[PDB]
């Protein structure tokens, strides 16, 4: 009669390396690191993403013709571009502070596009809706969807006067320009005056503009400019806008309702009917693995990013037949 | 001491094996696999707890202008990135070492149970087996590894056959 | 750590067990029935691989899948987690209520 003691041996192959040793072989084994992806853009708790695609946050907060599609977006839950989003301020000129209204614009869950001031009796005293060709839509010439171009009517240009009240119980992004001529003759034909002014005002905001007219090189073909503004209405707040010229007028703007969990990532991925928690510009995530190695940006509960290649880990006995 | 593991065992990882004039085979040791397997299921909760969730980490931008804050925020990310690959990796290697040798722990463990519960009424052999001096049914077999082998029911008529020798 | 769970001379029942508590999702779950206490079947995280047992005979294909990380066996029973992809009784430590 004979007893004997032993343990486990397998005819698996997992390898694991410890402080000791290296390539040790385990009769069992989990990975701590996760590689796979769905690699799509999924649902994230029951919304779908706001995907602007050939247009960026300039032009969709601006409302250039070629995404005309978004305005009708009212709720999200993370705003996708993508590599080939060009399509932002298609007449050049500077947005100020752009990168503030990006990270101001990365914690919205939602907003109400509505009408600040009426094109049609808000401006009684002067044309309404101009037009270019570095806006183009099918090929007739066209502005942003957001903004109003103001000009002169029957050779006057007389002093706005408009300011709008937040009754609204949220937030109010409001947003505007100023237009820099390239010469002398434009300021003249537009505005009826070289010298010329824009006061903002609110009761936390104070600015003044002044037209700079010089030549510049043509870019998207034209030698102007227009520089855009922006501003945050707090609730009760009133706005006035004073103007001897050059204002590109506030048409519509967003009523904000802040959120949580949001962001803007850039991605290659197609559109698709699943949900998830965790979602990567490579796809979505669907384990609950500690560590990742899949890319860094992330939203949602998603696993923490490291570079490792293999992070298994032992649980079972050392393999040894 | 042990000439490797056993690939005919196929229920848990510390077992007996047992050959006698009734039957022969395997068979696992419940209690000491058990206890194991709440042991690294702990390491599993604690890997997984105490590490956080990247609740979202999405990009920045910033101006021509700004490129010192632009290389600062590169810096926090690089800085934080290595630190965290750092981290896992070396908790990979001290949680591995503690496993290993956790099982081996255990193995001696039982090992000394089984010389404890026999005292010197079987010819101890360095590959860890146990061959006794004495007939060893399989209700003496099963009650080895149930804990309960009586010492006298099996030692005194092993007197004379271990002076034989 | 949890497992939820929910005859006639003939035909096949079909049952289902549901991972409960903390991430059970990254155990491996199996089943087994008493009349003694013995094994049924189980399934590898990620339905990777499958055991069954004796009586089985490779019958009773079991999966999990998306909703509520639940799986379905078809052709008193309890269900279990273990953290080894194996279908050993030993490496079983967390047990459902029975059904």
């Known amino acids: 009669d004979t007893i004997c003691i032993g343990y486990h041996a397998n005819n698996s192959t997992d390898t694991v390396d410890t402080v000791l040793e290296k390539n040790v072989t385990v009769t069992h084994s989990v990975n701590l690191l996760e590689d796979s992806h769905n690699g799509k853009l999924c649902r994230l708790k029951g919304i779908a993403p706001l995907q602007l695609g050939k247009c960026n946050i300039a032009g969709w907060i601006l409302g250039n013709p070629e995404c005309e599609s978004l305005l009708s977006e009212r709720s999200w839950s993370y705003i996708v571009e993508t590599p080939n989003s060009e399509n932002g301020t298609c007449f050049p000129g500077d947005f100020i502070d752009y990168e503030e209204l990006r990270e101001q614009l990365s914690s919205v869950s939602s907003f109400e596009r509505f009408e600040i001031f009426s094109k049609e009796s808000s401006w009684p005293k002067h044309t309404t809706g101009g037009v270019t060709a570095a806006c183009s839509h099918a090929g007739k010439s066209s502005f942003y969807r957001n903004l109003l171009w103001l000009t002169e009517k029957d050779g006057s240009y007389p002093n706005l006067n408009n300011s709008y009240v937040n009754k609204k119980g949220k937030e109010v992004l409001v947003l505007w320009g100023v237009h820099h001529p390239s010469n002398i003759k434009d300021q003249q034909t537009l505005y009826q005056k070289e010298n010329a002014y824009v006061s903002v005002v609110s009761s936390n905001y104070n600015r003044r503009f002044t037209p700079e007219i010089a030549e510049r090189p043509k870019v998207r073909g034209q030698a102007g400019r227009i520089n855009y503004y922006w501003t945050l209405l707090k609730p009760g707040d009133t706005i006035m806008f004073e103007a001897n010229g050059n204002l590109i007028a506030p048409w519509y703007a967003f009523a904000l309702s802040r959120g949580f969990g949001s962001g803007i990532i850039t991605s290659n991925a197609s559109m698709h009917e699943c949900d998830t928690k965790c979602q990567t510009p490579q796809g979505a995530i669907n384990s609950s693995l500690p560590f990742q190695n899949i890319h860094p940006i992330t939203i949602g509960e998603c696993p923490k990013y490291v570079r490792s290649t293999k992070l298994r880990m032992v649980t079972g006995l050392r393999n040894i037949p | 001491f042990i000439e490797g593991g056993w690939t005919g065992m196929i229920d848990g990882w510390y077992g007996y094996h047992w050959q006698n004039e009734q039957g022969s085979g395997y068979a696992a040791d419940q209690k000491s696999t058990q206890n194991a397997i709440n042991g690294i299921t702990n390491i599993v909760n604690s890997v997984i707890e105490k590490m956080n969730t990247q609740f979202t980490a999405v990009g920045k931008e910033f101006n021509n202008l700004e490129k010192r804050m632009e290389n600062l925020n590169k810096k926090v990310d690089d800085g934080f990135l290595d630190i965290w690959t750092y981290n896992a990796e070396l908790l990979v290697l001290l949680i591995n070492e503690r496993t290993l040798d956790f099982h081996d722990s255990n193995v001696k463990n039982l090992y000394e149970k089984v010389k404890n519960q026999l005292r010197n009424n079987a010819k101890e052999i360095g590959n860890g087996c146990f061959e006794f001096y004495h007939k060893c049914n399989n209700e003496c077999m099963e009650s080895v590894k149930n804990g309960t082998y009586d010492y006298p029911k099996y030692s005194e008529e092993s007197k004379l056959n271990r002076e034989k020798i | 750590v949890q497992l939820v769970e929910s005859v006639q001379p003939g035909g096949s029942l079909r049952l289902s067990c549901a991972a409960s508590?903390?991430?059970?999702?990254?155990?491996?779950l199996g089943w087994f029935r008493q009349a003694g206490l013995e094994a049924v079947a189980a399934?590898?995280?990620?339905?990777?691989?499958?055991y069954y047992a004796d009586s089985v005979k490779g019958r009773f294909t079991i999966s999990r899948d998306n909703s509520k990380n639940t799986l379905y066996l078809q052709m008193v029973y309890y269900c279990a987690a273990s953290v080894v992809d194996s279908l050993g009784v030993g490496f079983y430590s967390y047990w459902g209520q029975g059904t």
């Open positions: 399934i590898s995280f990620d339905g990777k691989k499958t």
């Open positions: 508590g903390k991430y059970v999702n990254l155990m491996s």
